[PDB]
Write a protein that binds this ligand. Structure first.
Ligand SMILES: CS(=O)(=O)NCCc1ccccc1
Length: 166
Protein backbone atom coordinates (compact mmCIF):
# COMPACT_ATOMS: atom_id res chain seq x y z
CA UNK A 1 0.00 0.00 0.00
CA UNK A 2 1.63 3.21 -1.25
CA UNK A 3 1.87 6.46 0.66
CA UNK A 4 -0.29 9.21 -0.87
CA UNK A 5 1.41 10.67 -3.92
CA UNK A 6 1.24 14.21 -2.51
CA UNK A 7 3.59 13.14 0.30
CA UNK A 8 6.09 11.70 -2.20
CA UNK A 9 6.57 14.89 -4.23
CA UNK A 10 9.33 17.46 -4.04
CA UNK A 11 8.85 20.87 -5.57
CA UNK A 12 12.21 22.04 -6.89
CA UNK A 13 12.66 25.80 -7.17
CA UNK A 14 15.56 27.80 -8.51
CA UNK A 15 16.28 25.58 -11.50
CA UNK A 16 18.73 26.48 -14.18
CA UNK A 17 16.74 27.38 -17.26
CA UNK A 18 18.85 24.70 -19.00
CA UNK A 19 17.55 21.91 -16.74
CA UNK A 20 15.30 19.44 -18.57
CA UNK A 21 12.98 16.64 -17.49
CA UNK A 22 15.84 14.29 -18.30
CA UNK A 23 18.60 16.14 -16.41
CA UNK A 24 16.37 16.71 -13.38
CA UNK A 25 15.54 12.99 -13.37
CA UNK A 26 19.17 11.90 -13.76
CA UNK A 27 20.05 14.04 -10.76
CA UNK A 28 17.28 13.09 -8.37
CA UNK A 29 17.26 9.39 -9.26
CA UNK A 30 20.41 9.17 -7.14
CA UNK A 31 18.14 9.09 -4.06
CA UNK A 32 15.28 6.86 -5.18
CA UNK A 33 12.93 5.63 -7.87
CA UNK A 34 11.20 8.54 -9.62
CA UNK A 35 7.65 7.87 -10.77
CA UNK A 36 7.38 11.41 -12.22
CA UNK A 37 9.76 14.27 -13.02
CA UNK A 38 8.72 17.49 -14.80
CA UNK A 39 10.28 20.88 -15.52
CA UNK A 40 7.59 23.57 -15.74
CA UNK A 41 7.76 25.52 -19.00
CA UNK A 42 5.91 28.36 -20.64
CA UNK A 43 3.18 26.93 -22.92
CA UNK A 44 4.13 29.19 -25.86
CA UNK A 45 7.89 29.75 -25.71
CA UNK A 46 8.85 26.44 -24.01
CA UNK A 47 11.26 28.50 -21.89
CA UNK A 48 11.71 27.08 -18.41
CA UNK A 49 9.76 28.68 -15.59
CA UNK A 50 12.68 27.86 -13.29
CA UNK A 51 10.95 25.21 -11.19
CA UNK A 52 9.71 21.67 -11.46
CA UNK A 53 8.81 18.68 -9.37
CA UNK A 54 9.84 15.08 -8.86
CA UNK A 55 7.78 12.26 -7.37
CA UNK A 56 9.51 9.41 -5.55
CA UNK A 57 8.13 5.91 -5.01
CA UNK A 58 8.28 6.25 -1.21
CA UNK A 59 8.46 8.84 1.57
CA UNK A 60 11.82 7.42 2.72
CA UNK A 61 13.18 8.36 -0.70
CA UNK A 62 11.92 11.93 -0.25
CA UNK A 63 13.74 11.99 3.09
CA UNK A 64 16.93 10.72 1.44
CA UNK A 65 16.76 13.46 -1.19
CA UNK A 66 16.16 16.15 1.43
CA UNK A 67 19.02 14.82 3.57
CA UNK A 68 21.34 15.13 0.55
CA UNK A 69 20.84 18.90 0.25
CA UNK A 70 22.31 21.17 -0.89
CA UNK A 71 21.54 19.97 -4.41
CA UNK A 72 23.50 21.50 -7.27
CA UNK A 73 21.58 20.60 -10.44
CA UNK A 74 23.14 21.53 -13.79
CA UNK A 75 25.48 23.95 -12.00
CA UNK A 76 22.90 25.79 -9.87
CA UNK A 77 21.93 25.20 -6.23
CA UNK A 78 18.21 24.46 -6.23
CA UNK A 79 15.52 24.66 -3.52
CA UNK A 80 13.60 21.43 -2.87
CA UNK A 81 10.54 21.50 -0.64
CA UNK A 82 7.90 18.96 0.15
CA UNK A 83 4.24 19.69 -0.63
CA UNK A 84 -1.72 26.74 -2.19
CA UNK A 85 1.76 28.10 -1.40
CA UNK A 86 4.43 26.75 0.93
CA UNK A 87 4.73 28.44 4.33
CA UNK A 88 8.46 27.90 4.85
CA UNK A 89 9.26 28.21 8.56
CA UNK A 90 11.69 26.68 11.03
CA UNK A 91 9.55 26.88 14.18
CA UNK A 92 6.63 24.86 15.53
CA UNK A 93 4.01 25.40 18.19
CA UNK A 94 3.53 22.31 20.40
CA UNK A 95 0.30 22.34 22.38
CA UNK A 96 -1.25 19.98 24.88
CA UNK A 97 1.91 19.19 26.86
CA UNK A 98 0.37 20.15 30.24
CA UNK A 99 2.50 21.09 33.26
CA UNK A 100 4.68 17.96 33.50
CA UNK A 101 6.44 18.11 30.11
CA UNK A 102 10.07 19.27 30.28
CA UNK A 103 12.73 20.34 27.80
CA UNK A 104 14.28 16.88 27.51
CA UNK A 105 10.92 15.31 26.59
CA UNK A 106 10.60 17.69 23.65
CA UNK A 107 14.26 17.40 22.66
CA UNK A 108 14.35 13.60 22.75
CA UNK A 109 11.26 13.40 20.55
CA UNK A 110 11.82 16.22 18.08
CA UNK A 111 15.56 15.78 17.56
CA UNK A 112 14.79 12.88 15.22
CA UNK A 113 13.02 15.30 12.85
CA UNK A 114 15.88 17.78 12.60
CA UNK A 115 18.56 19.71 14.40
CA UNK A 116 17.04 21.73 17.25
CA UNK A 117 18.30 25.24 17.99
CA UNK A 118 15.76 26.53 20.56
CA UNK A 119 13.21 24.95 22.88
CA UNK A 120 10.92 27.41 24.63
CA UNK A 121 8.57 25.96 27.25
CA UNK A 122 5.97 28.65 27.89
CA UNK A 123 5.35 29.84 31.44
CA UNK A 124 2.89 32.30 32.90
CA UNK A 125 4.22 35.86 33.05
CA UNK A 126 2.76 36.38 36.51
CA UNK A 127 3.17 33.05 38.35
CA UNK A 128 5.88 31.22 36.40
CA UNK A 129 3.64 28.16 36.11
CA UNK A 130 3.87 26.15 32.93
CA UNK A 131 1.13 27.01 30.46
CA UNK A 132 1.02 23.69 28.61
CA UNK A 133 2.64 24.67 25.31
CA UNK A 134 6.07 25.20 23.80
CA UNK A 135 7.92 26.33 20.70
CA UNK A 136 10.70 24.39 19.00
CA UNK A 137 13.01 26.05 16.48
CA UNK A 138 15.04 23.92 14.06
CA UNK A 139 17.93 24.84 11.80
CA UNK A 140 15.92 24.08 8.65
CA UNK A 141 12.36 24.01 7.38
CA UNK A 142 12.19 20.36 6.29
CA UNK A 143 12.03 19.23 9.93
CA UNK A 144 8.87 21.31 10.38
CA UNK A 145 7.42 20.08 7.09
CA UNK A 146 7.84 16.44 8.16
CA UNK A 147 6.36 17.18 11.58
CA UNK A 148 3.18 18.95 10.53
CA UNK A 149 2.10 16.28 8.02
CA UNK A 150 1.97 13.55 10.69
CA UNK A 151 -1.52 12.80 11.97
CA UNK A 152 -0.28 12.26 15.56
CA UNK A 153 2.46 13.38 17.93
CA UNK A 154 2.86 11.66 21.30
CA UNK A 155 5.24 13.45 23.68
CA UNK A 156 5.52 12.57 27.38
CA UNK A 157 2.35 10.50 27.04
CA UNK A 158 0.35 13.48 25.75
CA UNK A 159 -1.45 13.64 22.41
CA UNK A 160 -0.02 16.93 21.16
CA UNK A 161 -1.26 19.54 18.70
CA UNK A 162 1.61 20.70 16.48
CA UNK A 163 1.46 23.58 14.02
CA UNK A 164 3.79 25.83 12.05
CA UNK A 165 4.68 28.96 14.06
CA UNK A 166 5.29 32.38 12.48
C1 LIG B 1 25.13 15.67 -5.54
S1 LIG B 1 24.48 17.10 -4.74
O1 LIG B 1 24.07 18.03 -5.75
O2 LIG B 1 23.54 16.65 -3.75
N1 LIG B 1 25.71 17.81 -3.95
C2 LIG B 1 26.78 18.39 -4.77
C3 LIG B 1 27.81 19.14 -3.95
C4 LIG B 1 27.49 20.61 -3.85
C5 LIG B 1 26.24 21.04 -3.45
C6 LIG B 1 25.96 22.40 -3.36
C7 LIG B 1 26.92 23.33 -3.68
C8 LIG B 1 28.16 22.91 -4.08
C9 LIG B 1 28.45 21.56 -4.16
Amino acid sequence: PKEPEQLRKLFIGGLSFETTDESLRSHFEQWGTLTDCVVMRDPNTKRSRGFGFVTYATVEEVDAAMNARPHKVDGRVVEPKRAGAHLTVKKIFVGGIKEDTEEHHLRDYFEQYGKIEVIEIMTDRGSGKKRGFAFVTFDDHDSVDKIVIQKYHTVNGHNCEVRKAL
